[PDB]
Ligand binder design. Structure first.
Ligand SMILES: Nc1ncnc2c1ncn2[C@@H]1O[C@H](COP(=O)(O)OP(=O)(O)O)[C@@H](O)[C@H]1O
Ligand SMILES: Nc1ncnc2c1ncn2[C@@H]1O[C@H](COP(=O)(O)OP(=O)(O)O)[C@@H](O)[C@H]1O
Lengths: 108, 131, 48, 447
């Protein structure tokens, strides 16, 4: 954790409670993965402990997302969604909730 | 060191070059699989065995996060900043312990100075809408 | 336009710029490194 | 932010004609007063303007011109201007009259080597070739046994093929010491092997080896290509007269013995003409009949001038440019026959004479300026006016030749540019042909 990230969460929380979306637009290398993961870590009220999310991203990033979800707080049920039609079909049938995030890319 | 270029044909020329001089290269490019974008990253960090990494600014310059690079060479400049800046900051990063040198390699007068003039003009006009 | 675009973004964008969190890591040195064209390049550029 | 800027390579060296870039004519064929590096000589340049259209027309053979005029009048400069005006694609063959005196071959044949060398030829040669890593190599014996067939496996980034070849190719591969895992090239036209190196796939196989490891070839194992060869009829004559192509022990050793010239027989030149006429009929060739330039022509021997009567009348011959700096000399080899320009009257009919003439002081100032800014130096106007004065006192070349010594003195005593005191000093350090001929005639008792 770092203080500027936690103050980012306290800023995002009022947007979330107002039904307002926002941009984390900080200069590169400042932990937007950590901040967007921390939506789960610093709102205790169930929606952000067992609710299903989705991440859409450039294809080179998919594994650093999947890794960083394990490094900060590994408790969340994370689904990868990349590679062959058979492999993505196997995972697609899981969401037939325990799907706390899916990690994805825009072509898919 | 990281090397960025636009043309896949040029990255093939640079791979021909770093086969010839024994520079222990590795590359990421539009043709490369997610299982390569896993492993080729994970082997450039966690090791000293790979002196140079070869990249596209578009396939490589987003979220790749190569903190083990010390320096960056733009063999091409793109018509737009941000793309270069994202590519630079994927060496110049939280978790480094060093300066970063970024080199732009440019032909005098022919065409690359027109790209660079637009990059300069954009890199200032892009400020006043934010700060 | 500048102040309106700022005021539209201020309620729902965060943009710190590096020195406000990278407090102790220094900026990039940028080296604009010039090259001449080689003789074969000068000829092919002239042919274009 | 920061910049880096480098270029360590030295320039080309400045030569006695390298300011000449073309004849400096306008589109109507009139001379500009000074352009493309030249100054003055308007009639002699407009006459060369007719000759550069003569060359580009291709129609003629053996037409010839004599640039005639005193030393320093620019004769070789106009012939160099023609060489620039034609561009690199047409052969201009520079020659000096005293080069015919070979000790390997007759004078009356050194002229034919140059005449055949000035006729250029562009050939659309189709080469068909094999290249790859040698994955397999097997020679086959057959009954009277002897080696009679060759099986070769070749591999590239585009898969692999097995090829079947003539035993002369196996003897070539054995000569090149080709073995499995080598990367090779074979043009099937010459049957010529090149061992490119050892395949880079094997570069880790030893801690220490002599080989050049090379990356695996790209595209098909077997492929055809067109090479746009530039060649001259002399290159066809001489390559057939002492053959180094093919792969037998004889061609392999005509490549070792001393490369003596030989008096090529007219039967060979005839069979070359028949062959290249067929490459022209086939559309495989374009002929580019160029220029022979004989500087100092006035000392070809009378054997040679009398050969040139026949040579300049050939339907094959190139266009020929001669230069002479001489008056009514005795012609070499005649004992005591005198004729204009040192050339027999019998040859002197066969040439269009381009008279070239002494410069005014104003043309000398203007050449010296154009020359100084080509030698890369800055010169003050009273110093250049003093060089123009020296031009009237002496000659164009001495006046030009004081420039670089003056620039040496200028930088040595710390100036940026030539001051008149530098030229005025250099004029006393170095004598000239006219002023030396005073002290050397005055002190004549002592030499
Ligand atoms: N507390 C932390 N401890 C270690 N690394 C951190 C920490 N907070 C952030 N990071 C670093 O943040 C980086 C991720 O930044 P990222 O989200 O990719 O930024 P951006 O998208 O702006 O370029 C990772 O390299 C990670 O190690
Ligand atoms: N018309 C000219 N324009 C420019 N430079 C000339 C001209 N005529 C002569 N020169 C230069 O002056 C020198 C003498 O000319 P050159 O051709 O060498 O004379 P020559 O007929 O005796 O061989 C050379 O450096 C030459 O390039």
């Amino acid at each position: 954790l770092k203080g500027y990230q936690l103050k980012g969460m306290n800023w995002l929380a009022n947007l979330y409670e107002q039904g307002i979306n926002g941009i984390l637009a900080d200069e590169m290398g400042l932990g937007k993965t950590v901040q967007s993961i921390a939506l789960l870590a610093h709102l205790a009220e169930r929606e952000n402990i067992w609710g299903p999310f989705l991440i859409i991203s450039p294809a080179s990033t998919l594994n650093n997302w999947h890794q960083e979800f394990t490094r900060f707080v590994p408790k969340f049920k994370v689904l990868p969604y990349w590679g062959n039609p058979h492999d993505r079909k196997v995972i697609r049938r899981f969401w037939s909730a325990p799907f706390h995030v899916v990690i994805t890319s825009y072509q898919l | 060191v990281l090397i960025y270029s636009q043309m896949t044909r040029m990255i093939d020329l640079l791979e021909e070059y770093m086969v010839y001089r024994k520079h222990t290269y590795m590359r990421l490019d539009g043709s490369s699989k997610i299982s390569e974008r896993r492993d080729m990253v994970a082997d450039f960090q966690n090791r000293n065995d790979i002196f140079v990494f070869l990249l596209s600014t578009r396939a490589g310059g987003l979220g790749i996060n190569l903190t083990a690079a010390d320096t960056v060479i733009f063999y091409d400049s793109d018509w737009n900043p941000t793309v270069d800046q994202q590519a630079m900051d994927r060496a110049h990063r939280l978790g480094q312990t060093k300066q970063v040198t970024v080199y732009r390699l440019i032909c005098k007068g022919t065409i690359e100075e027109r790209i660079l003039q637009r990059a300069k003009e954009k890199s200032e006009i892009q400020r006043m809408v934010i700060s | 336009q500048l102040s309106r675009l700022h005021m539209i973004l201020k309620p729902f964008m965060l943009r710190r710029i590096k020195k406000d969190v990278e407090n102790e890591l220094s900026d990039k040195i940028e080296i604009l490194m010039y090259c001449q064209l080689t003789s074969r390049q000068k000829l092919l550029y002239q042919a274009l | 932010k920061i910049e880096e800027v480098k270029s360590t390579t030295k320039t080309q060296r400045i030569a006695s004609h390298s300011h000449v870039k073309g004849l400096g004519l306008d589109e109507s064929g009139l001379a500009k007063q000074a352009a493309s590096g030249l100054v003055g000589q308007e009639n002699a340049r407009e006459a060369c303007g007719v000759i550069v259209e003569l060359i580009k027309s291709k129609k003629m053979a053996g037409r010839a011109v004599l640039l005639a005029g005193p030393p320093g009048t620019g004769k070789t400069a106009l012939a160099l201007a023609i060489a620039q005006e034609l561009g690199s694609k047409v052969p201009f063959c520079p020659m000096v009259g005293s080069e015919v005196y070979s000790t390997e071959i007759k004078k009356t044949e050194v002229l034919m080597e140059n005449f055949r060398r000035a006729i250029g030829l562009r050939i659309k040669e189709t080469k068909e070739v094999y290249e790859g890593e040698v994955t397999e190599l097997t020679p086959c014996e057959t009954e009277n046994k002897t080696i009679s067939h060759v099986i070769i496996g070749l591999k590239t980034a585009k898969g692999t093929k097995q090829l079947k070849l003539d035993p002369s190719i196996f003897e070539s591969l054995q000569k090149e010491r080709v073995e499995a895992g080598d990367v090779i090239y074979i043009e099937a036209n010459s049957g010529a092997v090149k061992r490119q190196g050892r395949c880079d796939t094997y570069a880790t196989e030893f801690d220490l080896e002599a080989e050049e490891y090379v990356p695996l070839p790209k595209g098909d194992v077997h492929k055809k290509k067109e090479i746009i060869q530039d060649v001259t009829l002399h290159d066809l004559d001489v390559a057939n007269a002492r053959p180094q192509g093919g792969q037998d022990i004889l061609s392999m050793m005509g490549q070792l013995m001393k490369p003596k010239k030989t008096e090529i027989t007219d039967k060979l030149r005839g069979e070359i003409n028949k062959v290249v006429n067929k490459y022209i009929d086939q559309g495989i060739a374009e002929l580019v009949p160029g220029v022979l330039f004989v500087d100092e022509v006035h000392m070809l021997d009378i054997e040679c001038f009398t050969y040139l009567h026949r040579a300049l009348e050939s339907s094959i011959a190139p266009i020929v440019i001669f230069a002479s700096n001489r008056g009514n000399c005795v012609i070499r080899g005649t004992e005591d026959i005198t004729s204009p320009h040192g050339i027999p009257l019998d040859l002197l009919d066969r040439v269009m004479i381009i008279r070239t003439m002494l410069y005014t002081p104003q043309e000398m100032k203007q050449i010296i300026k154009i020359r100084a800014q080509t030698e890369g130096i800055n010169i003050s106007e009273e110093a250049l006016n003093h060089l123009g004065e020296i031009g009237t006192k002496t000659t164009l070349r001495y006046s030009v030749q004081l420039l670089t010594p003056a620039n040496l003195l200028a930088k040595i005593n710390g100036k940026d540019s030539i001051e008149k005191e530098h030229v005025e000093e250099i004029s006393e350090l170095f004598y000239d042909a006219k002023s030396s001929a005073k002290i050397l005639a005055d002190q004549q008792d002592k030499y």
